[PDB]
Amino acid sequence: SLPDAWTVLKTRTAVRNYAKEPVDDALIEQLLEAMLAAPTASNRQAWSFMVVRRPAAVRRLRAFSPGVLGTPAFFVVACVDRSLTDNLSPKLSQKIYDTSKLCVAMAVENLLLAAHAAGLGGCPVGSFRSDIVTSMLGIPEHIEPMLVVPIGRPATALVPSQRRAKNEVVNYESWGNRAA
Amino acid sequence: SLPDAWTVLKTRTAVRNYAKEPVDDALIEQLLEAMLAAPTASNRQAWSFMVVRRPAAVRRLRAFSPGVLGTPAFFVVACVDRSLTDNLSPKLSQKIYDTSKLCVAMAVENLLLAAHAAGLGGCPVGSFRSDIVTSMLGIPEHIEPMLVVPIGRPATALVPSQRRAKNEVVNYESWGNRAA
Amino acid sequence: LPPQLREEIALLAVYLLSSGRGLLEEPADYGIYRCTDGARRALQLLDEHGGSTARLTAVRERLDEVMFAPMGEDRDMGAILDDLCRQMADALPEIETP
Amino acid sequence: LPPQLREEIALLAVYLLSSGRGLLEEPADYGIYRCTDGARRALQLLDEHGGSTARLTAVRERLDEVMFAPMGEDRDMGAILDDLCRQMADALPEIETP
Ligand SMILES: *Cc1cc2c(cc1C)nc1c(=O)[nH]c(=O)nc-1n2C[C@H](O)[C@H](O)[C@H](O)COP(=O)(O)O
Ligand SMILES: *Cc1cc2c(cc1C)nc1c(=O)[nH]c(=O)nc-1n2C[C@H](O)[C@H](O)[C@H](O)COP(=O)(O)O
């Protein structure tokens, strides 16, 4: 049955080994519909996304993305649309341009959560050659790629990571009060 | 029963009207545990978070955050820990300092999803006086606040937003192919 | 050369070139994994076309575990690389061309 | 796979493994040339078996000049790597398998 949200949120782990079995189009569309519900600053929706899944294009994009391990079923590339963020002085441009990316990261998180709830896996990758993919995909100059995320079915069992204890990263009512 | 993840992901809406009924501590701890499962770059966990809920402190932080509407049950402040991101030239510092914030936004998204699945509401707020809250909470100089998010029980019924059609923001295999 | 094989070598060349450029904007302990992942991809190229005998596979399977392990684990990269070099040296005579 | 071809891939794997280990006892600007020399050897593998069309060769010949230049020359490694990535990207469609 569809998973309860709380178990799903804790269980999501970065998946880097993907299996050869492909993902059908209806599931891709449903995941993309689930991932667009993220918040956006002032309802502006200053973002662009792209879906690459053809067997040759996924492997050509994988080469120019050294941080990607394993060959996924399809690629989703998330970008920030700069056309709808320039105004007045460049100070306001920087102010409304950092905030634009802060909202794009949330959409990627939503996408990974949706693709994990369905039995697949994914991992955001930031180490990629920006200009080359912009030239290859025909992305205009006013659209800036930010994150390349692969999605696919895990090939091996999931293994959690090791994280610092809650006390270390969280404080109550004052810096240093890791008890209250 | 606990909600299926797919219905919950689509339904999350920004909540700005919160009710006076407070949230008990066990729920706060469970939401904080659910929100720490976000991905972090190279497993570094270069972030800090703080929980403010005392009735006086929430209202004093609310004044210095003009973008916050309504009085929530408690406040969660998410910051990026800069101590674990400086190295070699400042170019690498910028490279590993933007990526650090990109991962902090995902934790906020996880927190909102977890607090919506429980029957509460929340909305990320970026328009706040950074220096004043840093002085008030005792946050050291190497920790930079990024986002202030209120959490609480919605006072009125939820109302979705108006979003551009899927065709407008999504392209398949090339820039301009909003059909495939 | 088979067309699929021809593509695989060229895409390996792009990865090494792209990794080399992207090493100027990444930490100092990153050329270790790029070369380790490069050796993983070369051996993965062999057994996908039937060129791995019995030990050329046992190195690519151990390279997989090191590469796919969760990040942050304290692994003695010097010791494992030394072992893999020793194993791979013992496997070359099996495929030596006279 | 031809026996000579099989050896060439495996010896490429040894070079990447050996370079990765020997990067712990060498300067910080050395993973740049190991990856650049790795891309040189992969493309040198193609034209030795007739797999370089017209531009897969023009990159391996420019990689030769950069690699075989006398040491100490002040070369903007970022600019040339960017150009070579751009050239190699334009050459992939010529060898694309449908
Ligand atoms: C992503 C983001 C959303 C924000 C931000 C900042 C960022 C980086 N700041 C906001 C703020 O200061 N005030 C405020 O009211 N909302 C802020 N939001 C959220 C955004 O405005 C809404 O979420 C959106 O406009 C409505 O979409 P919805 O479907 O959630 O109702
Ligand atoms: C938030 C983030 C995570 C990344 C990024 C970039 C950003 C902004 N880039 C990655 C990359 O290039 N390669 C890669 O393998 N992972 C990247 N990640 C994710 C992160 O490394 C892992 O998610 C994390 O280290 C493991 O945590 P886990 O609990 O999900 O296993």
Residue numbers in the entry:
A (entry chain B), B (entry chain A): 13 to 192
C (entry chain D), D (entry chain C): 8 to 105
The authors write:
3D helical reconstruction yielded a map with a global resolution of 3.14 Å where a single C2 symmetrical dimer of AlbA (AlbA2) and a single C2 symmetrical dimer of AlbB (AlbB2) form a heterotetramer representing the biologically relevant asymmetric unit of the filament. The AlbAB filament lacked rotational symmetry along the long axis, instead exhibiting repeating units of AlbA2 and AlbB2 with a helical rise of 46 Å per AlbA2 and AlbB2, a helical twist of 120°, a helical pitch of 138 Å, and an overall diameter of 100 Å. One FMN cofactor per AlbA monomer could be unambiguously localized in our cryo-EM density. Masked local refinement containing one AlbA2 and two surrounding AlbB2 units yielded an improved 2.78 Å map allowing confident model building for the dimers AlbA2 and AlbB2 as well as the bound FMN cofactors. The AlbA monomer consists of five α helices and four anti-parallel β strands. AlbA dimer formation is mediated by extensive interactions between helix α4 of both monomers, which is further stabilized by interactions with helix α1. AlbB forms a dimeric 8-helix bundle with each monomer containing four α helices arranged in an anti-parallel orientation similar to four-helix bundle proteins. The AlbB dimer is formed through extensive intermolecular interactions of 35 residues contained within helices α1, α2, and α4 in a knobs-into-holes packing scheme often found in four-helix bundle or coiled-coil proteins. The most significant inter-dimer interactions occur between helix α3 of AlbA and helices α1 and α2 of AlbB. The FMN binding site is located at the interface of the AlbA2 and AlbB2 dimers, with clearly visible cryo-EM density corresponding to an 8α-S-cysteinyl linkage between the side chain thiol of C115 of AlbA and the C8 carbon of FMN. The positively charged AlbA residues R24, R28, and R175 are highly conserved and coordinate the phosphate group of the FMN ribityl chain.
Here, we report the structural characterization of the Streptomyces noursei enzyme AlbAB, a cyclodipeptide oxidase (CDO) carrying out α,β-dehydrogenations during the biosynthesis of the antibiotic albonoursin. We show that AlbAB is a megadalton heterooligomeric enzyme filament containing covalently bound flavin mononucleotide cofactors. We highlight that AlbAB filaments consist of alternating dimers of AlbA and AlbB and that enzyme activity is crucially dependent on filament formation.
